Design a protein around this ligand. Structure first.
Ligand SMILES: [Cu+2]
Ligand code: NA
Length: 639
């Protein structure tokens, strides 16, 4: 089940309009209060008109609308379940504009929801594009519109939230498909739960940013239930998904062919582990006692060329453990791993002790000191994030988290870690005065300008509960060493939530829940459009365009020559991310040093060290004098 974000509006003076309505199944039979009666479109004697079908509401007066609900027919018949839909709002009743919520709903008889940002309106409209099984009809038992307590206009220069993307599943895990631009999402064996899994099945869903179509799929070929995994993009351009409910399995996703290929089994059975792509294109993973048993799980490496998993027992998991109250079951989870120089992997936390991991031979480990500052020694920060915003200078920003996984208070702790050569202890200082709001179970992404977008979370970590939420997002600008509060949202994004950077420069934020009978399931996602895409008037600014590229595939140390339509100031390369349970080891940014050739032609060099410039797919963004970025050009880096 799910829950709305507002309170129900009285339907006593409502006037409804429909495109088609049968005798006995009228248009007003959706607002009467009876769970057994329903509105239904023309069938039988009146013919069978195909979708789009529309339902328009007139609330007589202006209300502060923040969502709607749709209860299907409860008579056991499938005829009329709404699949693809669109929600519109208006003040006049003729000019509707752009949709506040669009997407697809699951094929069942449960109550469906569309939760969006507060916007004052008198007229509400629900358009049913398709039927769940592809039939000509549309039916609704009960339709309600919800309102917020008050409305406050969004502050200029602090971004905008919206629109909402309705999904058939709860996206607990996600990744961007580089070659197509789509957002691949997955849950478990079911759309709303994970417990009591038979194994061998994962339900996936994808969203296209250009078309707006949401299409679901069922993956059984890999014999893996991909809930609670370790995700990494290898050097061969394939997404390596490891463990979880089927603790020993590995699944590979190829973006070019849009298919799932079976991978070889791991040496050790894991769950809730973090995996990281190395300098040679290989994938390293360590720990993970979330599933497959509770014991000492040391490191292991995946080779994409030979299709094998090899154990590295001397790469000890013992110095990276937290002092969690639940023991080893939670202490080796969600490691802040980063692929670095000469096959090494840096562990920034969540534990107080930071370590260097080596992959040559049977593996090795060395102490990198404690995560600290002049404010003292930093405690254990489970489910806190770690983002590499400047890979050239080895800059990592760590923030949030709590001492224990569950039933523990979060802190405002924030640090800057500067990486050098493997084996040396890095310099650690405090990032400004810390976060504005203490948060755990939060997610983050690196933006084109070097800034880090932080959103969601809760003050006290209690899984499957939406208690003490943080609605206000934060942005960290490194040049000024300052945190900035952005415009707040209305949907709670706690445990099982994700955040990914879209090729168009915007942020995809969704998920939260996945507990079955709970009312905390979020079958949606929201889009955040940052300040850099807006001008002085508050409208969408003109974005510069990359007209030509010399090559789409480059090697480490090689040069690329581009051509633009206007003058640019800065340029950056961002690696495509993957997200689940606050972990994102794939994302990183490289600031580019440009050479002006003249006539809007620029040249740059991709770093020679493959530990800085990790092999895989990257996003090319160029910024003008106003700071407005372009859309991303997909560049593949090899070694
Ligand atoms: Cu989980
Ligand atoms: Na009814």
């Amino acid at each position: 089940a799910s829950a709305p974000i507002g309170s129900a509006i009285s339907r006593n003076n409502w006037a409804v309009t429909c495109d088609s309505a049968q005798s006995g199944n009228e248009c007003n039979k959706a607002i009467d209060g009876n769970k057994d009666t329903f509105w239904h479109t023309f069938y039988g004697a009146n013919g069978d008109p195909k979708p789009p079908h529309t339902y328009t509401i007139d609330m007589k007066t202006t209300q502060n609308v923040n969502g709607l609900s749709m209860l299907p027919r409860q008579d056991g018949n499938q005829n009329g379940w709404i699949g693809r839909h669109e929600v519109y709002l208006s003040s006049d009743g003729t000019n509707w504009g752009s949709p506040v919520a669009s997407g697809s709903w699951f094929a069942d008889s449960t109550t469906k929801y569309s939760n969006f940002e507060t916007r004052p309106a008198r007229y509400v409209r629900l358009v049913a594009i398709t039927e769940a099984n592809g039939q000509p009809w549309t039916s609704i038992a009960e339709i309600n519109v919800f309102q917020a307590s008050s409305y406050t206009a969004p502050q200029p220069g602090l971004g905008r939230w919206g629109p909402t993307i309705d999904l058939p599943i709860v996206p607990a895990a996600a990744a961007i498909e580089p070659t197509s631009g789509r957002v691949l999402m997955w849950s478990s064996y079911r759309n709303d739960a994970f417990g009591g899994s038979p194994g061998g099945i994962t339900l996936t869903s994808s969203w296209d940013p250009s078309t707006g179509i949401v299409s679901d799929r069922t993956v059984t070929v890999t014999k893996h239930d991909m809930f609670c995994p370790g995700i990494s993009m290898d050097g061969n351009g394939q997404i390596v998904v490891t463990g979880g409910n089927d603790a020993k399995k590995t699944s590979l996703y190829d973006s070019s062919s849009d298919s799932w290929i079976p991978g070889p089994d791991m040496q050790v059975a894991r769950g809730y582990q973090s995996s990281a792509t190395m300098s040679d294109g290989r994938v390293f993973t360590i720990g993970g006692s979330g599933s497959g048993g509770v014991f000492e799980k040391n490191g292991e490496v995946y080779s994409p060329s030979s299709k094998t998993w090899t154990s590295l027992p001397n790469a000890k998991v013992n110095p990276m453990l937290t002092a969690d109250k639940q023991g080893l079951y939670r202490s080796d989870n969600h490691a802040w791993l980063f692929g670095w120089k000469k096959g090494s992997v840096f562990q920034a936390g969540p534990s107080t002790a930071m370590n260097w991991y080596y992959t040559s031979g049977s593996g090795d480990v060395k102490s990198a000191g404690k995560r600290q500052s002049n404010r003292g020694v930093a405690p254990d920060a489970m489910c806190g994030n770690a983002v590499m915003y400047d890979a050239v200078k080895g800059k990592i920003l760590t923030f949030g988290g709590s001492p224990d996984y569950q039933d523990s208070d979060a802190t405002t702790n924030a640090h800057i870690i500067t990486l050098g050569e493997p084996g040396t202890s890095p310099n650690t200082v405090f990032a400004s005065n810390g976060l504005y709001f203490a948060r755990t179970f939060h997610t983050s992404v690196v933006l084109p300008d070097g800034s880090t977008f932080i959103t969601g979370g809760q003050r006290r970590g209690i899984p499957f509960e939406d208690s003490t939420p943080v609605f206000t997002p934060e942005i960290y600008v490194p040049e000024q060493d300052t945190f900035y509060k952005q415009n707040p949202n209305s949907i709670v994004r706690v445990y099982h939530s994700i955040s990914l950077l879209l090729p168009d420069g915007r942020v995809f934020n969704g998920g939260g829940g996945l507990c079955g009978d709970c009312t905390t399931n979020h079958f949606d996602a929201q889009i955040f459009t940052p300040n850099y895409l807006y001008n002085s008037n508050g409208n969408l600014a003109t974005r510069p365009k990359i007209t030509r590229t010399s090559t789409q595939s480059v090697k480490v140390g090689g040069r690329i020559t581009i051509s633009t339509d206007s003058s640019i100031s800065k340029a950056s390369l961002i690696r495509y991310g993957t997200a689940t349970h606050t972990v994102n080891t794939d994302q990183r940014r490289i600031p580019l040093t440009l050479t002006n050739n003249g006539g809007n032609s620029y040249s740059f060099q991709v770093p020679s060290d493959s530990g800085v410039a990790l092999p895989g797919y990257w996003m090319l963004f160029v910024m003008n004098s106003a700071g407005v970025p372009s859309v991303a050009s997909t560049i593949r880096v090899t070694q």
